Amino acid sequence: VKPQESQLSFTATPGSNPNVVTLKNTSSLKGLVVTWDLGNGVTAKGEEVVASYPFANTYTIAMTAYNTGGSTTITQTITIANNDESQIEPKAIILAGGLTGSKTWVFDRAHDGHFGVGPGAGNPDYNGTPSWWSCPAEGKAECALYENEFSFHLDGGYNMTWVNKGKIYTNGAGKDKLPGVATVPGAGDFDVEYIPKEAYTFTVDGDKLKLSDDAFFGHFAGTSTYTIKTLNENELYLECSSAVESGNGWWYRFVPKK
Amino acid sequence: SFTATPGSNPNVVTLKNTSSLKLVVTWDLGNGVTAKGEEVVASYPFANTYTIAMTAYNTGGSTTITQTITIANNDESQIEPKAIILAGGLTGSKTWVFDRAHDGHFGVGPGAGNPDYNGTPSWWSCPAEGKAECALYENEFSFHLDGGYNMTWVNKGKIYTNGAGKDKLPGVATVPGAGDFDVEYIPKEAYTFTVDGDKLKLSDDAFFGHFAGTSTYTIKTLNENELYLECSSAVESGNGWWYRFVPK
Ligand SMILES: OC[C@H]1O[C@@H](O[C@@H]2[C@@H](O)[C@H](O)O[C@H](CO)[C@H]2O)[C@H](O)[C@@H](O)[C@@H]1O
Ligand SMILES: OC[C@H]1O[C@@H](O)[C@H](O)[C@@H](O)[C@@H]1O
């Protein structure tokens, strides 16, 4: 009674934009209600629906046909070859150095002001700058900070890789919130043992950059949320608000790895 | 013949020779750019009507055909982000005035070239309403992206300055309640600006109501709520000025 699979079919035809695909019931059987799992977290109902895949990947599309004696499901895989710049955050494209490949960012250790502290954005004294202390060139050479490197890549999603040599840098208020062994390096404050996960994601919304899985840009201040102050192919300048020291703001400047 | 075909970005247009005659062609895109090629791309960041001219060349000489094109909207992707904040968006306008109700909306200190520079108006910081009794707060600045980076300067006929400034200006100077000088100074009907990084430059010798002999300002803060500016005096060597504007 339930619809027979050999009479069910559909076409999935990329349109003007190869990442936007028309899904059309072409079944040799009428009197059907059809629903769709687009394989991208979206479900839909209708004879002809459109599916959008911002990211290059292989997806599975399921069509379910309903008639008076039940439902039957058929599938196709579809290969989306390339990322769609028109459906991806423009700042994510700068962080990854393009829609293809990856881009690694490191502390701007060769120039003054690559790391700094000042009154944070909720502090009555905020001025938007690290007005308490600004790190001179190579000022944090003698700790774990510059060992922390951040690669962005749009391989299936808004993906990040965090590499270090097993340690992050923080101060007394930071060290108390992490389980790893704390050491006092040459630059003072604390190195803490902290091994990143093998994979992260991120989101960009306006100026706000958020890292997944409680990640942070090598300096621990209890937050995974940053404000992008500057971002172009040469420079990533970030501000954050400390969650471990009420009213402290931190600034960080990254440049491309050579 | 030619076609002017808006692409995936409606502000970016493919100009293509479609002539039924196989020619060297050049183009005036009507945006200040000229080009040579069978197929060229034109960019119009600003909504407007533009005239495109194709010139075809043989041995006999040259013939020029034109079309008008209408670009409906401003293109956020090709306009300075700080310009959009000053104009309050891609449409309409936004007027900025002195933050007269808060301390520190006007001040003086050692300027950025001065060995004593500390980045603040450390010689004098104006208290709330401190310059009510002069022309300073009468000066209002509107930014609008209507064809370009456009500004309108409104006042009630006077700017505010000190002795060194008054000596550079042709208008009559008067001493108001706040002291220093009001100077007769009527703005032009229209100005332009440029923003490059943190450098804000005004056209046609304009200045932000207080005269210090410069049209160049450093942007210290710019968000939808605040414009905080520094400038370096061109009439008093080593003197810096600070100004804080908020929306009207
Ligand atoms: O905390 C308020 C005070 O901050 C002081 O600067 C400190 C920096 O020298 C140091 O490098 O970082 C700590 C925070 O991690 C800062 O507190 C300022 O010098 C004081 O002016 C300020 O009141
Ligand atoms: O115009 C410059 C002068 O401004 C005055 O308000 C300050 O008190 C002086 O310190 C400064 O020399």
Side-chain angles (χ1 to χ4, degrees), chain A residues 11-56:
Chain A
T11 58
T13 312
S16 66
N17 182 342
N19 291 52
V20 180
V21 181
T22 300
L23 271 37
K24 179 187 187 173
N25 177 28
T26 59
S27 298
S28 56
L29 184 65
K30 303 318 171 74
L32 288 188
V33 169
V34 305
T35 68
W36 308 91
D37 186 328
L38 274 46
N40 59 359
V42 178
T43 60
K45 186 169 89 60
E47 277 294 298
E48 205 169 28
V49 308
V50 167
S52 182
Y53 308 97
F55 295 94

Side-chain angles (χ1 to χ4, degrees), chain B residues 108 123-124 162 180 236 239 241:
Chain B
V108 65
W123 296 333
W124 171 85
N162 59 6
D180 291 311
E236 302 177 298
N239 283 16
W241 301 93

Side-chain angles (χ1 to χ4, degrees), chain A residues 23-245:
Chain A
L23 271 37
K24 179 187 187 173
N25 177 28
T26 59
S27 298
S28 56
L29 184 65
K30 303 318 171 74
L32 288 188
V33 169
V34 305
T35 68
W36 308 91
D37 186 328
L38 274 46
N40 59 359
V42 178
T43 60
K45 186 169 89 60
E47 277 294 298
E48 205 169 28
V49 308
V50 167
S52 182
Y53 308 97
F55 295 94
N57 218 326
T58 302
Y59 300 93
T60 299
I61 294 154
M63 194 189 74
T64 301
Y66 294 86
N67 73 1
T68 55
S71 75
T72 295
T73 293
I74 53 161
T75 67
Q76 276 166 42
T77 65
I78 185 174
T79 300
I80 309 290
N82 294 287
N83 288 331
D84 180 354
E85 64 274 6
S86 67
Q87 294 193 81
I88 294 168
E89 282 295 338
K91 295 182 168 65
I93 300 177
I94 304 175
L95 288 169
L99 281 174
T100 62
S102 69
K103 190 167 173 156
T104 300
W105 298 83
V106 297
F107 273 97
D108 185 28
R109 57 190 294 168
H111 297 101
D112 298 344
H114 57 272
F115 176 42
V117 68
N123 186 319
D125 291 324
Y126 183 60
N127 57 58
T129 74
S131 63
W132 295 333
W133 168 86
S134 174
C135 191
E138 290 299 313
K140 295 301 182 179
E142 302 315 309
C143 66
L145 183 63
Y146 307 154
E147 297 171 349
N148 285 265
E149 311 191 341
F150 300 89
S151 306
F152 303 84
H153 32 89
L154 302 175
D155 61 329
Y158 294 105
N159 294 328
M160 191 185 76
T161 303
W162 176 8
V163 166
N164 68 12
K165 287 162 165 189
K167 297 170 171 169
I168 66 76
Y169 189 62
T170 193
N171 55 16
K175 98 186 213 298
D176 282 346
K177 294 284 197 279
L178 294 175
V181 171
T183 51
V184 176
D189 294 317
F190 293 95
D191 285 344
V192 178
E193 294 187 8
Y194 188 103
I195 301 168
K197 292 168 58 58
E198 298 208 327
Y200 290 89
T201 64
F202 69 93
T203 60
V204 169
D205 181 27
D207 293 342
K208 180 179 293 155
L209 173 57
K210 301 201 294 165
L211 309 185
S212 74
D213 300 282
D214 295 325
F216 53 86
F217 282 112
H219 180 244
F220 178 72
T223 186
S224 298
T225 298
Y226 295 84
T227 304
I228 303 164
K229 301 305 289 166
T230 311
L231 173 56
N232 60 54
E233 66 166 8
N234 301 136
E235 179 181 340
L236 172 63
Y237 191 44
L238 299 165
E239 179 179 325
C240 76
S241 171
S242 180
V244 297
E245 294 181 301

